[PDB]
């Protein structure tokens, strides 16, 4: 499977998502993630609402297989559940 992290290297959650995703890579095998930087690529608010839906959260957020997962707590749990039981 593929993962996408829309955060920056230093916006805690961002690093956390990265930590988590990076981790899975060595336990799931079919788990390749991509790093995306909200202030490098060019995202505002509308984008996120269109690509994720966005609750009234800020940054960062996670995407797995292109479907939206949420901000971070969600990815943590969601991952725990669907990837590491």
Distances (CA, A) of 1 to 4, 23, 40, 56, 79: 11, 14, 24, 28, 12
Q: State the greatest distance between any 2 C-alpha atoms of the chain, in Å, as a whole number.
A: 35
**Range of the structural domain that residue 64 is part of:** 1-85
Half-sphere exposure of 1 (CA within 13 A, CB side): 16
Q: Pick the catalytic residue: 14, 33, 70, 71?
A: 14
Q: How many domains does the chain have?
A: 1
Half-sphere exposure of 47 (CA within 13 A, CB side): 11
Active site residue 18: yes
CA 68 – CA 79 distance, rounded (Å): 13
Reduced DSSP (H G I as helix, E B as strand, rest coil) percent helix, strand, coil of the chain, to 5:
40, 20, 35
Distances (CA, A) of 78 to 6, 32, 40, 42: 17, 17, 27, 27
Active site residue 8: yes
CA 63 – CA 16 distance, rounded (Å): 14
Q: Pick the catalytic residue: 7, 70, 71, 72?
A: 72
Query: What are the beta bridge partners of residue 2?
Result: 32
CA 21 – CA 19 distance, rounded (Å): 6
Among 45, 36, 39, CA closest to 64: 36
PDB experimental method: NMR
Q: Pick the catalytic residue: 7, 16, 18, 71?
A: 18
Q: Kindly state the tokens that stand for 53.
A: 């839906």
CATH number reported for the structural domain that contains residue 54 in this entry: 3.40.30.10
3-class DSSP assignment, residue 33: strand
């Amino acid at each position: 499977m593929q993962t996408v992290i829309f955060g920056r290297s230093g916006c805690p959650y961002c690093v956390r998502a990265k930590d988590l995703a990076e981790k899975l890579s060595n336990e799931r095998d079919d788990f390749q993630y991509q790093y995306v930087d909200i202030r490098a690529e060019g995202i505002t608010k509308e984008d996120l609402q269109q690509k994720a839906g966005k609750p009234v959260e800020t940054v960062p957020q996670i995407f797995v297989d292109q479907q939206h997962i949420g901000g971070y707590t969600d990815f943590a749990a969601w991952v725990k559940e669907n990837l590491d039981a």
